[PDB]
Amino acid sequence: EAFYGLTTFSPSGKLIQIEYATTAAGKGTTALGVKATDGVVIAAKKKAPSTLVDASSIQKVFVLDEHVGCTYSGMGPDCRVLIDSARKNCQQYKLMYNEPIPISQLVRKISAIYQEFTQSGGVRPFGCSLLVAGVDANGYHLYQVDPSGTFWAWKATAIGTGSPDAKAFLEKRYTVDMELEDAVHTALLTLKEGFDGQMTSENTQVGRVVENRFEILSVDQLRDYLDQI
Amino acid sequence: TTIVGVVYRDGVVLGADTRATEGSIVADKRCRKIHYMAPNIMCCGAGTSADTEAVTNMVSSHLALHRLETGKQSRVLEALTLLKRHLYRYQGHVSAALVLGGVDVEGPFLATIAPHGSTDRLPFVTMGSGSIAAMAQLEAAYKDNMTCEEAKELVASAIRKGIFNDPYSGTQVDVCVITKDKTELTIGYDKPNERMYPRQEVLLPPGTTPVLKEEIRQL
Amino acid sequence: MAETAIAFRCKDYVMVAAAGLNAFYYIKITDAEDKITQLDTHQLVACTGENGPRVNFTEYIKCNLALNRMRQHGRHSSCESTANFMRNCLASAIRSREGAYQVNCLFAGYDTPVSEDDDGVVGPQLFYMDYLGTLQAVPYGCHGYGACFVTALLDRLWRPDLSQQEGLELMQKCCDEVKRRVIISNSYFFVKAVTKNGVEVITAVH
Amino acid sequence: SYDRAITVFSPDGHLFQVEYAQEAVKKGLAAVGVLGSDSVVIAVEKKSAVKLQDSRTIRKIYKVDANIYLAFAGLSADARVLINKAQLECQRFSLNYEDTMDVDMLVRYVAGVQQKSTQSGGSRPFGVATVIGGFNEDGKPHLWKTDPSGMCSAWRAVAIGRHDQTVIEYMEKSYKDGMSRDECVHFAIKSLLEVVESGSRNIELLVLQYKEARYLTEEELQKFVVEVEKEREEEAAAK
Amino acid sequence: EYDRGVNTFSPEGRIFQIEYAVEAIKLGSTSLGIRTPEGVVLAAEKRVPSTLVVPSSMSKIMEVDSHIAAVMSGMVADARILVEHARVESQNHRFTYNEPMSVESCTLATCDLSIQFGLMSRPFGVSLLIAGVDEKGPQLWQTDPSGTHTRYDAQAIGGGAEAAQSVFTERYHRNMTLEEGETLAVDILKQVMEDQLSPENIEVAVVRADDGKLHMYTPTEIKAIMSRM
Amino acid sequence: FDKYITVFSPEGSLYQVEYAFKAVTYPGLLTVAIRCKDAVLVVTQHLIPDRLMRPDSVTALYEVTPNIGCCMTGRAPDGRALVQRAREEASDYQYRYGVEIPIAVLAKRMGDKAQVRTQQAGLRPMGVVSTFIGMDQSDQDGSLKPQIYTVDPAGWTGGHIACAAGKKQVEAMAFLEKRQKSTELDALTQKEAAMIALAALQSAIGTAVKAKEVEVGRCTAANPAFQRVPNSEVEEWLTAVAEA
Amino acid sequence: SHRYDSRTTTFSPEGRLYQVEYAVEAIQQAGTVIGVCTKDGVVLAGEKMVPHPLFDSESMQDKNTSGEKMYKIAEHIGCSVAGVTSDAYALLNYARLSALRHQYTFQEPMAIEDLCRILCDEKQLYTQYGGVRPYGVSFLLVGWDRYYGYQLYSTEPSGDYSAWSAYAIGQNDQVAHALLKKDWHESMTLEDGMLLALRVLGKTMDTAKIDLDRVEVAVMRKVPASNIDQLLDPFKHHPKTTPRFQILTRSELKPHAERADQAREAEEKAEAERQR
Amino acid sequence: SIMAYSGGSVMAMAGKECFVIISDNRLGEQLKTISTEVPKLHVVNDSIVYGLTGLRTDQQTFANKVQFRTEMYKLREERDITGKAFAAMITSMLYEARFGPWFVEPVIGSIDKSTGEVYLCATDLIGAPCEPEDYVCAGTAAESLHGMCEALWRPGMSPEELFEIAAQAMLSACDRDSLSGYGAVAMIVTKDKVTTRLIKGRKD
């Protein structure tokens, strides 16, 4: 009913209410992706408030459709709107073109919804950076999306709290050759830096694009990779 | 079309002819009438091929989206109820006559959705032109707690009635076993109608058909 | 069907001809109703239906083309364009509450180079259009009872290369064949040709 | 939709959001109209001959329909909405009534539209004063001015835009009722030169005659500018 | 400002935007009406901004129907929108009831538009003085921005409206000739308006009780009133 | 200006939503839910200071669908209203998909409803923490396995082995966390689990509670419908807490 | 909620839409883009964000339709943008639809003045109706049409578009205008317009050489049309030369950029001789 | 019949790493002919050719739509649409108007440029895809063309062989159809090159 825009321009030129929403997406727990030749891995730390919170009920990494998943930083409630939208865009695409949506198109449609919630009336921007990872005919993609609507493709990046120091550490480790089993190693080593307390199958969620599917690693498959690092 | 389901002890077996007609013509001899709804739910379709395909897809989609939201295998009741409510809203104008087989936690489930939005959850079913001929073979031979082998050989038998004893059904029997664990879609489980007389290759050598103009474009 | 339009396209002009007959049931009111409207300097449309849909369709086009020449600072749109606009409007109409504009058009024009940079068709363009929106580029077309008499008579005589002068002789035979052979008294014909120079009203032929 | 009230009265009875739209006109580029016996002259100032702006001719005096032209002053963006609304109205008119709509009618439309904006919830006013000229079908020439309030008046000669009052206070001294095509053009430029830069390359102008619109070439023009800037050296010698 | 809404009362019971729109009339041109039994008069200073203005254009007085004139004061723009509605109503009445609209009913139909503000942002900044002839005889009414339609025997609205009501209380008597009313109307405008009075500087227009028709007085005819004075 | 609408502060926090979490603390009611092996409890405080107030009428815990019980904590009336949204939601589901809404979805749909109020300006976030409890059929074997899901005014859905909401939710979580190190908490009998919940209720507020000053909700694998527990059976747990 | 309305779509006391004047200031923080309308084609040269080593290229099977700065709006209309990228995509997608909705109807390419007018009536709207911020994006459309040939058009948040022969938007648009004015002449080869556009880009962002990593270039020009297919529509005329918006690769840009390196070098040996 | 009004026939045919799609040239109203130079083929990209048959109005309308959708794909997606998608996009477009349909039967040929596998689709007017290995046909000559194509067509044929049986099929069917003929425009697509041929037939 309040149809007036919340996001406006300051006299400096900047859209203040997005700088603040980007400050909100820079606050939540660290999550990060690493593109290999033969796949990508996104991992995030689901640091639960207490030990009583069922770890399996928390989800920091989501399947958007068979062939693409995402993670996020910042406001989980908000993210769960971009995700539930995206999941629709991935079906509504399948239905029309009988084809898994290209990540490129999927991220542009997520990007468009971030944009709507800057311009449009009586809504604040979303307080979450996505980190979409998936596979199309055009190979493997990692993409960051921001509250601005701006989206970058990356070879590897991080979002959340440790993300200035995780992107410093990811730059040294990363080589172009890097294969998926050495990437998952490299991704988990990056979380391990900024982590306080030990990592476990209940403490992190790892999703990986491999072959032509995205899948979240079951707590067994994660324990195998956590026993090596 | 003639499509068939039976409940056997472990799960469901669906069956279909393959002949897709336009009027009194065979457009496609091998068309696949057993669509994927979900990993534990297949859905044969008779009636208007467009409507059967479109409804089936819209639901298979809806279920796949809902199977993320929950983090749970899609229940056959859910699939059924979406086909119902969709087909009812169109007063049967959407002329899709579906057999919806699957296996959830509750056990083997096999329905028909008639075009109007009627549902008959049953142990063995048929839809399409040849349904009546099939449902004869099914009523005669069906017994409870069949093995996967008996139940395929029956379904195949019941499709083969519709295939021969009806025109619109023909060619080969596709059969699909949905069990608790997996979904085996055997295409041409049975080819009764093989080739009678081998193709007499008429030889039209290049430069036969006279050509006024030509334009080649390289890539 | 009562009122015959004829058109044909040669090296360097389109000729168009349209019944003068204005009818109320079986009553000739007059033989002097110009049905060839002029949409531009270089484009005209032999429309032949009932007066209501004929006028309300040729006006709608003639306005929405004038409106485009305003918003496009005096730029004269191609024939391909207006033809495709006319048909897109006719087609839109068969799937609206209104129903089809019940008008059979022979749209004709002469694309001139609009500036230095124009690489497009120079020369004359004729398009046959059904009431449904069946657009089709043709050498010669017709609408009305007389159509099929002329259509065959043109097949016979029409060559692509005849003069402005052999086009008057031919268009007289096409008009005289509708007079001899159709009961409906299409007794006077408005004939207009499109050239490089514009639309000229041929008075010689009728 | 957002239909909060933007245009509202203040203690003193002012519509502030219209006073402020008129301030957007005063800052905009000056434009001038001159009615003669047989001819209307609308003459605008351009932002001035930058070496970059396309050598292909862009006209600051917009055609609304064959008979009717209009020059604006204020927000280019907004004016281009009025003109495309007017252009539309003139052909929405030709459809409903076989007639080509006359100037004094179209003005009262555009004015009506400029008013709607000063009384619509959601809209600010159009920051656009509009000098419409043109000829009726009958033969009579007409000149009009629409200011952003919505209020339209017809003039014998007029200015809008920067130093609009300085021009009108100059014009109503020297104007004469019956004027020829050449005296009108002479006078239009003469009046514009009161406020605009000494240069002849900024002034573009249009001469409407019955069924005959013609913009002056920068060759035709610089004859009349040399002829006038020598007459503003005769009026500088007297004082 | 935009601190107070539009539909807002003061501590002394008047809607603000109305109380304000009324102060917008006191700036506008002075306009007045004289209800004599022979017929009703309307006269208005045009207050032309310059010599150049074709005076016949910016008409302070407006035919609403054969038998009704309006004169306006304040925002001329807004008055066009009232008078345009009044015309359509006057003709809807003629269309429906094969008869002249009353003057009362035409003034009611002009305050059916002047109430609905919250569909429109603000009230009209205009006071109309509607005058005509029907079965009741010659009547003169005043609309405000408020919506308060008030039959008068003689009223002035606008700049020196308060200076002209001073003169009316002295000079006006119910049994006036149409000739005396014209003489009064122009006597007042001369004393009240800022410029020197000319035939082009004002418009006068009367509805005569006999024929029940509106005559707009040409400058020749207005000079005939300034003659006998 | 940051504070009175749902927009980000310079530090990226929606102040209205921090201020709804305060509206959960304000009434001074504390609820504790606890999953056991075969069942869920939700224990709520039920304080009626008026002698004239009918105890029966004032409830924290509503039924949402037969299989899913709520337990609202915060502005009672905002609670009341969410329960109505939750019922509307669970009936909408029942009709469109022809099965009972799985609690995990219900919670996650109410999560997205409460999010919408943190995004569209001029809606007040519901000053309340929904604590949905219910059995949820695991699709592996067919077993009914107990669940708790808290929504909070941010729109943050989460599952819980046990959980508290309200006045002393910090000190009641501190007590449950310290008693998670001793025992397994999902290998417990319904009786043992209750004694831990009703000891957390007791530890937190600082007083021994009566069987009248709490109402207790329940779902079991045996009886999956959401039951209120009778005050007889609660008194057998408060006597068994005072002993050990 | 009426209390907290910014009132975006209002005048200020001086008679200027503040939210627009600010959105303009938002475009002067963006990356510089230089358009140059020649007779052989048009050139856009754009200043990309300093490339972080981990930035990938979304492996798009078609290179020439989009890059960082330059986007194809339809076969015959390119564009570069400056300002809020998020908004540019919003409008770009609206512009794409508009230039095809024209083609759907009229079965010919849209004029450029036509798209530039549709795209800027969409931007004006947000300054007048709707109480939302205006789109904070300046376009730089380039296209070829039969009407006026190779055209370049600056756009603005306000709505006002103007055509230009060579223009700049972004970081040093005022500096670029001074340098373009001086070195632009009415007859100019595509290779001489490329040269200018990179020399002016090289001078604004204040490098010794044109850093290939930080500049994109786009080229609207006409090439021979190969895919005629004359037999499928016999009466339809297919022009010999069709326009084809190309974004230059890093290797395709190198010989053009090594010439703007050497035309900076030859002007710095002339500045060493003016002092002597 | 509304489909048979404007007339025409289209037929596509799969060989080894090539397909031949081939239309007639006629455009009618019922039995009366308008033009004999109206081939029904359109070319989406290098690797997709689709014929439309049925009411000409809708051939033209629904073509302009497909052109608007496959251009909007080529800009947004930044790649040429693949047979699979294109054919399923068309079924969606037709079925969007299940009630009030487009009187068009799209025959689609296509060929994956990498693999070299052929994809054919003969959608009915409400988007019922029929995707056979061999060949497809539609329009007024449809019965007659199935007869021809069934006899003449063998699996792994080479572009030249195929064209000669695609041409003999389209022609020998349009002899036995009032509402098709005036030759034929074939179009032989290979991974390599696209050969457009105008075939001489009867004038009937």
Name the residue among B44, B7, B15, B42 with its Cα closest to residue B123.
B7
Contact B219 H46 (CB under 8 A): yes
**Token pair for residue F58?**
């004032």
Name the residue among B126, B125, B123 with its Cα closest to residue B108.
B123
**Token pair for residue H184?**
């034929």
**Token pair for residue E209?**
């009780």
Rounded Cα distance between A24 and E126, Å, is 52
Whether the CB of C64 is below 8 Å from some CB of chain D: the reply is yes
Q: Which domain holds residue F39?
A: 1-244
- How many domains does one find in chain H? 1
**Token pair for residue F199?**
């000891």
Rounded Cα distance between B178 and H7, Å, is 46
**Token pair for residue G7?**
């009132």
Rounded Cα distance between A35 and H74, Å, is 26
What SS3 class is residue A135? Answer: strand
C65's CB contacts (< 8 A; 6+ apart) are C39, C40, C43, C77, C82, C85
Contact G165 D23 (CB under 8 A): no
Angstroms from G128 CA to nearest CA on chain C: 22
Angstroms from H98 CA to nearest CA on chain B: 9
Q: Give how far Cα F67 sits from Cα of A90, C12, F56, F89, Å.
A: 33, 84, 22, 14
- For residue D12, give the DSSP letter: T
- Count the Cβ atoms, other than its own, within 10 Å of residue E33: 30
What SS3 class is residue A119? Answer: helix
Contact G93 H76 (CB under 8 A): yes
C95: which chain H residues are within 8 Å (Cβ-Cβ)? 100
The answer for G 228-267 residues in CB contact with H (under 8 A) is: 229, 231-235
Backbone angles phi, psi at A83, to 5 degrees: -65, -50
B96: which chain H residues are within 8 Å (Cβ-Cβ)? none
Experimental method of this PDB entry: cryo-EM
**D195, D30 in Cβ contact below 8 A?**
yes
Rounded Cα distance between B162 and B146, Å, is 22
Of C75, C120, C138, the CB nearest to G237: C120
Name the residue among F97, A68, A107 with its Cα closest to residue B62.
F97
- For residue A30, give the DSSP letter: P
- How many domains does one find in chain F? 1
Q: Which residue has the tokens 């709607």?
A: D116
- Count the Cβ atoms, other than its own, within 10 Å of residue H195: 19
Which chains border C (3 or more CB–CB pairs < 8 Å)? D, G, H
The packing angle between helices E178-192 and E161-171, to 10°, is: 140
Task: Render the burial of E160-190: b for 16+ CB within 10 Å, e for the rest.
Answer: bbeebbebbeeebeeebebebbbbbbbbbbe
Best A1, A3, A4, A145 member to test G by mutation, with max G CBs in 10 Å, is A4
Rounded Cα distance between E104 and E139, Å, is 8
C37: which chain D residues are within 8 Å (Cβ-Cβ)? none
CATH number of the domain to which H178 belongs: 3.60.20.10
Angstroms from G184 CA to nearest CA on chain A: 31
- How many domains does one find in chain G? 1
Contact D53 G162 (CB under 8 A): yes
In chain G, alpha helices (H)? 18-27, 85-106, 112-128, 173-183, 190-204, 254-268, 271-274
**H104, H59 in Cβ contact below 8 A?**
yes
Whether the CB of G50 is below 8 Å from some CB of chain A: the reply is no
- How many domains does one find in chain B? 1
Q: Which domain holds residue B25?
A: 1-219
Max CA pair span of chain D: 62
E strand or H helix that includes residue C115: none
- Count the Cβ atoms, other than its own, within 10 Å of residue D232: 12
Q: How far is C-alpha A72 from the geometric centre of its chain's CA atoms?
A: 4
In chain D the beta strands, taken as DSSP E runs, fall at 31-35, 39-45, 61-65, 68-74, 128-135, 141-146, 152-154, 157-160, 203-209, 212-215
Q: Which domain holds residue G148?
A: 1-276
Q: What is the CA radius of gyration of chain G?
A: 20
**Token pair for residue D211?**
């069924």
Name the residue among G161, G141, G138 with its Cα closest to residue G150.
G141
Rounded Cα distance between B142 and B123, Å, is 9
G117: which chain D residues are within 8 Å (Cβ-Cβ)? 80, 84
Domain E1-229 part of CATH 3.30.365.10: no
Q: How far is C-alpha G111 from the geometric centre of its chain's CA atoms?
A: 16
Which chains border A (3 or more CB–CB pairs < 8 Å)? B, D, F, G, H
| Chain B residues touching chain A at CB-CB below 8 Å | 57-58, 61-62, 64-65, 68-69
Strand order in the sheet with B3-7: B124-127, B3-7, B12-16, B173-178, B183-190
E strand or H helix that includes residue A62: strand A61-65
Angstroms from G79 CA to nearest CA on chain B: 28
**F86, F130 in Cβ contact below 8 A?**
yes
- For residue D167, give the DSSP letter: H
Q: Give how far Cα G10 sits from Cα of B209, E37, E77, G124, Å.
A: 74, 51, 20, 13
Best G2, G4, G5, G133 member to test F by mutation, with max F CBs in 10 Å, is G4
Contact F160 A6 (CB under 8 A): no
Sort residue F197 into left (φ over 0), alpha (ψ -120 to 50) or beta.
alpha
F3: which chain G residues are within 8 Å (Cβ-Cβ)? none
CATH number of the domain to which A5 belongs: 3.60.20.10
Q: What is the DSSP string of chain E?
A: --SS-SS-B-TTS-BHHHHHHHHHHTTS--EEEEEETTEEEEEEE---SSSSB-TTTS-SEEEEETTEEEEEEE-HHHHHHHHHHHHHHHHHHHHHHSSPPPHHHHHHTTSTTTS-B--BSS--SEEEEEEEEETTEEEEEE--SS---EEESEEEESTTHHHHHHHHHHH--SS--HHHHHHHHHHHHHHHSSSPP-TTTEEEEEEETTT--EEEPPHHHHHHHHHT-
- How many domains does one find in chain A? 1
Resolution in A: 3.3
Report the Cα–Cα distance between both ends of chain H, in Å, rounded: 21
Q: C99, exposed or middle or buried, with CB in 10 Å at 0-12, 13-18, 19+? A: exposed
E strand or H helix that includes residue A70: strand A68-71
Best G222, G235, G241 member to test C by mutation, with max C CBs in 10 Å, is G235
Domain D1-239 part of CATH 3.30.2450.30: no
Rounded Cα distance between B127 and C94, Å, is 38
- Amino acid type, E17: Q
**C161, C12 in Cβ contact below 8 A?**
no
B213: which chain G residues are within 8 Å (Cβ-Cβ)? 231
Whether the CB of C94 is below 8 Å from some CB of chain H: the reply is yes
Q: Which residue has the tokens 């002249």?
A: E100
Q: Which domain holds residue C138?
A: 1-206
Name the residue among C142, C129, C50 with its Cα closest to residue C87.
C129
Q: What is the DSSP string of chain B?
A: --EEEEE-SSSEEEEE---EESSSSEEESS---EEEEETTEEEEEEE-HHHHHHHHHHHHHHHHHHHHHHTSPPPHHHHHHHHHHHHHHTTT-S-EEEEEEEEETTEEEEEEE-TTS-EEE-SEEEESTTHHHHHHHHHHH--SS--HHHHHHHHHHHHHHHHHH-SSS-S-EEEEEE-SS-EEEEEEEE--S--SS--------TT-S-EEEEEEEE-
**F217, F71 in Cβ contact below 8 A?**
yes
Q: How far is C-alpha D177 from the geometric centre of its chain's CA atoms?
A: 20
The packing angle between helices D181-192 and D164-174, to 10°, is: 140
Q: G55, exposed or middle or buried, with CB in 10 Å at 0-12, 13-18, 19+? A: middle
Q: Give how far Cα G128 sits from Cα of B211, D121, G116, Å.
A: 63, 11, 19
Q: Which residue of A has its CA nearest to H92?
A: A96
**G147, C115 in Cβ contact below 8 A?**
yes
Whether the CB of G174 is below 8 Å from some CB of chain D: the reply is no
Whether the CB of E57 is below 8 Å from some CB of chain D: the reply is yes
- Count the Cβ atoms, other than its own, within 10 Å of residue C6: 31
Rounded Cα distance between H22 and D213, Å, is 55
Rounded Cα distance between G173 and G28, Å, is 7
E strand or H helix that includes residue G143: strand G137-145
Whether the CB of D88 is below 8 Å from some CB of chain C: the reply is yes
**E203, E53 in Cβ contact below 8 A?**
no
The packing angle between helices G173-183 and G190-204, to 10°, is: 140
H82: which chain A residues are within 8 Å (Cβ-Cβ)? 99
Q: Which residue has the tokens 């069987």?
A: F211
What SS3 class is residue H104? Answer: strand
Backbone angles phi, psi at B133, to 5 degrees: -60, -45
Contact H132 B26 (CB under 8 A): no
- Count the Cβ atoms, other than its own, within 10 Å of residue F143: 13
A117: which chain F residues are within 8 Å (Cβ-Cβ)? 119
The catalytic site residues of B sit at 1
Name the residue among A104, A74, A75 with its Cα closest to residue A90.
A104
- The angle at the Cα of G67, spanning G64 to G69, to the nearest 5 degrees, equals 125
- For residue F197, give the DSSP letter: H
Whether the CB of E15 is below 8 Å from some CB of chain D: the reply is no
